[PDB]
Design a protein around this motif. Structure first.
Motif, mmCIF file in Angstrom:
data_model
loop_
_atom_site.group_PDB
_atom_site.id
_atom_site.type_symbol
_atom_site.label_atom_id
_atom_site.label_comp_id
_atom_site.label_asym_id
_atom_site.label_seq_id
_atom_site.Cartn_x
_atom_site.Cartn_y
_atom_site.Cartn_z
ATOM 1 N N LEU B 81 -2.258 -9.137 -4.460
ATOM 2 C CA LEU B 81 -2.145 -9.302 -5.906
ATOM 3 C C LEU B 81 -2.569 -8.012 -6.595
ATOM 4 N N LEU B 82 -1.607 -7.297 -7.160
ATOM 5 C CA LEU B 82 -1.902 -6.275 -8.146
ATOM 6 C C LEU B 82 -2.196 -6.899 -9.504
ATOM 7 N N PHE B 83 -2.765 -6.085 -10.384
ATOM 8 C CA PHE B 83 -3.001 -6.447 -11.774
ATOM 9 C C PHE B 83 -2.529 -5.275 -12.615
ATOM 10 N N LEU B 84 -1.508 -5.476 -13.439
ATOM 11 C CA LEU B 84 -0.932 -4.345 -14.150
ATOM 12 C C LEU B 84 -0.918 -4.542 -15.657
ATOM 13 N N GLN B 85 -1.133 -3.434 -16.360
ATOM 14 C CA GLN B 85 -1.164 -3.339 -17.810
ATOM 15 C C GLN B 85 0.108 -2.661 -18.291
ATOM 16 N N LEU B 86 0.848 -3.337 -19.146
ATOM 17 C CA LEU B 86 2.099 -2.858 -19.703
ATOM 18 C C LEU B 86 1.870 -2.309 -21.106
ATOM 19 N N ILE B 119 9.986 4.827 -6.526
ATOM 20 C CA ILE B 119 9.096 5.870 -6.040
ATOM 21 C C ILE B 119 9.929 7.111 -5.767
ATOM 22 N N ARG B 120 9.535 8.227 -6.358
ATOM 23 C CA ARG B 120 10.205 9.498 -6.150
ATOM 24 C C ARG B 120 9.452 10.349 -5.139
ATOM 25 N N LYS B 121 10.115 11.418 -4.708
ATOM 26 C CA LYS B 121 9.454 12.519 -4.023
ATOM 27 C C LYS B 121 8.373 13.124 -4.920
ATOM 28 N N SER B 122 7.376 13.744 -4.276
ATOM 29 C CA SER B 122 6.174 14.319 -4.892
ATOM 30 C C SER B 122 5.329 13.281 -5.628
ATOM 31 N N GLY B 123 5.423 12.011 -5.237
ATOM 32 C CA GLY B 123 4.469 11.007 -5.656
ATOM 33 C C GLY B 123 4.647 10.445 -7.048
ATOM 34 N N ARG B 124 5.594 10.965 -7.824
ATOM 35 C CA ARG B 124 5.969 10.371 -9.099
ATOM 36 C C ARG B 124 6.453 8.941 -8.894
ATOM 37 N N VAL B 125 6.005 8.035 -9.761
ATOM 38 C CA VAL B 125 6.404 6.632 -9.723
ATOM 39 C C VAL B 125 6.857 6.243 -11.121
ATOM 40 N N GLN B 126 7.997 5.564 -11.208
ATOM 41 C CA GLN B 126 8.566 5.143 -12.474
ATOM 42 C C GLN B 126 8.873 3.655 -12.432
ATOM 43 N N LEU B 134 9.516 3.691 -17.584
ATOM 44 C CA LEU B 134 8.106 3.799 -17.915
ATOM 45 C C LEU B 134 7.352 4.375 -16.740
ATOM 46 N N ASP B 135 6.320 5.155 -17.003
ATOM 47 C CA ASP B 135 5.522 5.783 -15.958
ATOM 48 C C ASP B 135 4.409 4.846 -15.506
ATOM 49 N N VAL B 136 4.070 4.903 -14.217
ATOM 50 C CA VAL B 136 3.044 4.020 -13.653
ATOM 51 C C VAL B 136 1.956 4.834 -12.982
ATOM 52 N N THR B 137 0.705 4.604 -13.357
ATOM 53 C CA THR B 137 -0.414 5.351 -12.796
ATOM 54 C C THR B 137 -1.554 4.420 -12.437
ATOM 55 N N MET B 138 -2.442 4.867 -11.563
ATOM 56 C CA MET B 138 -3.568 4.043 -11.154
ATOM 57 C C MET B 138 -4.656 3.882 -12.184
ATOM 58 N N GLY B 139 -5.082 2.658 -12.435
ATOM 59 C CA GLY B 139 -6.127 2.414 -13.402
ATOM 60 C C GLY B 139 -7.511 2.664 -12.862
ATOM 61 N N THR B 140 -8.528 2.311 -13.638
ATOM 62 C CA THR B 140 -9.888 2.554 -13.202
ATOM 63 C C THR B 140 -10.142 1.735 -11.970
ATOM 64 N N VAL B 167 -8.208 -9.910 -6.510
ATOM 65 C CA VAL B 167 -7.464 -8.783 -7.066
ATOM 66 C C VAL B 167 -8.239 -7.501 -6.794
ATOM 67 N N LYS B 168 -7.575 -6.515 -6.194
ATOM 68 C CA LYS B 168 -8.227 -5.276 -5.786
ATOM 69 C C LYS B 168 -7.826 -4.060 -6.610
ATOM 70 N N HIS B 169 -6.545 -3.886 -6.933
ATOM 71 C CA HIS B 169 -6.057 -2.656 -7.543
ATOM 72 C C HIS B 169 -5.446 -2.922 -8.910
ATOM 73 N N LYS B 170 -5.629 -1.962 -9.814
ATOM 74 C CA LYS B 170 -5.061 -2.010 -11.154
ATOM 75 C C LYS B 170 -4.024 -0.908 -11.339
ATOM 76 N N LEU B 171 -2.879 -1.260 -11.920
ATOM 77 C CA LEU B 171 -1.847 -0.305 -12.303
ATOM 78 C C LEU B 171 -1.756 -0.219 -13.819
ATOM 79 N N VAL B 172 -1.515 0.982 -14.334
ATOM 80 C CA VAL B 172 -1.295 1.199 -15.758
ATOM 81 C C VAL B 172 0.129 1.689 -15.970
#
Ligand SMILES: [Zn+2]
Ligand SMILES: [Zn+2]
Lengths: 107, 186, 46
Positions: B81-86, B119-126, B134-140, B167-172
């Motif tokens: 289970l991820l937890f994501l903020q839109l 998921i793109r090359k060089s670690g970019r995630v959209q 929209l761009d996706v990055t790791m939360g606190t 729930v372990k990981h947060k996405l922004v």
């Protein structure tokens, strides 16, 4: 060191029970028997040593078959290793050569 | 107390200090294999950094969203289970909801595919969620316990509570304001 | 930078949209879990 109760999260105090010393909460029944050796090391900062070895101090680290210094290629030089901060630091090596018509300091 | 304390020139042996120090605290009263003396390994006291809870024992860097999604695909097939903020508004219209260009949220949309995650090359995630990406990055990085629970009031006064998982990981998720603006500058 | 790995489809479900809560325990570490502990009651105001 601060240690906190798994139940309520108040701060624990060390006290003595009838069989062991215990970490104990002040606000809930929780106690934790100290069964084995537990420790906490501070490692404080020692004095500077830079101006302590200069000027013909009582060094002693020289030994038979020691290496010659790289410039003069003679063994007319002292070398030592010391901690500059607390003893968890890996010891640094330093050496000074003093010969006729030749003064230098090297690393 | 005698003040004129005496000292000598002799050099302390290294092992002699080590073995004297050793004998001062290596003594142990662990012989009491009894109930009271015993201690519960799953209720140790909490050392303060929550990632570093273990102060007593039986004897970090930061991840990135390309690595998080790679671990849960290849290395381990287990579901998580991820937890994501839109963003505050998604690029939609509330369907027949009786409006005014009001905000659009996930509560207004209908079930189905909503977008695609690249998921793109060089670690970019959209997160491509329409025409827009929209761009996706790791939360606190939270390290306290989080539980995902259902509450259902199946009756007027009573119901069921059910714990679905941790729930372990947060996405922004955030809009890529540079790309939105490089279309039509101002 | 082409999408060389994990083009992942994203789907949306509404069947729990009025039911699902996130509970979090600010003082309890992620390794000590209440999964073993017997629970005696749960109370809510909806
Ligand atoms: Zn307590
Ligand atoms: Zn010299």
């Amino acid at each position: 060191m601060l240690l906190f109760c798994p139940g309520c999260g108040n701060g624990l105090i060390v006290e003595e029970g009838q069989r062991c010393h215990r970490f104990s909460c002040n606000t809930c029944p929780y106690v934790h028997n100290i069964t084995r050796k537990v420790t906490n090391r501070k490692y404080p900062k020692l004095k500077e040593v830079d101006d302590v070895l200069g000027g013909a101090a009582a060094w002693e680290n020289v030994d038979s078959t020691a290496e010659s210094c790289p410039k003069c290629e003679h063994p007319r030089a002292y070398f030592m290793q010391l901690q500059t901060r607390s003893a968890d630091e890996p010891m640094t090596t330093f050496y000074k050569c003093c010969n006729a018509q030749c003064g230098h300091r090297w690393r | 107390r005698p003040e004129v304390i005496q000292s000598h020139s002799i050099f302390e042996q290294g092992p002699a200090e080590m073995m004297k120090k050793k004998g001062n605290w290596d003594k142990t009263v662990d012989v009491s294999d009894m109930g009271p003396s015993h201690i519960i390994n799953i209720k140790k006291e909490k050392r303060e950094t929550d990632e570093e809870t273990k102060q007593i024992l039986r004897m970090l860097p930061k991840d990135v969203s390309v690595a998080e999604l790679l671990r849960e695909l290849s290395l381990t097939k287990e579901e998580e289970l991820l937890f994501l903020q839109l963003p505050d508004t998604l690029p939609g219209q509330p369907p027949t909801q009786d409006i005014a260009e009001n905000a659009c949220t996930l509560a207004d949309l209908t079930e189905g595919q909503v977008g695609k995650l690249l998921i793109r090359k060089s670690g970019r995630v959209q997160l491509l969620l329409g025409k827009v990406t929209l761009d996706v990055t790791m939360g606190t990085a939270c390290s306290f316990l989080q539980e995902l629970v259902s509450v259902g009031l199946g009756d007027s006064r009573t119901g069921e509570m059910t714990v679905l998982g941790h729930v372990k990981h947060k996405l922004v998720c955030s809009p890529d304001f540079e790309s939105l603006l490089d279309h039509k500058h101002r | 930078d082409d999408p060389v790995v994990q083009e992942i489809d994203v789907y949306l479900a509404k069947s729990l949209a009025e039911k699902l809560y996130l509970f979090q325990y600010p003082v309890r570490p992620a390794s000590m879990t209440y999964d073993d502990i017997p629970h005696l009651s749960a109370k809510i105001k909806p």
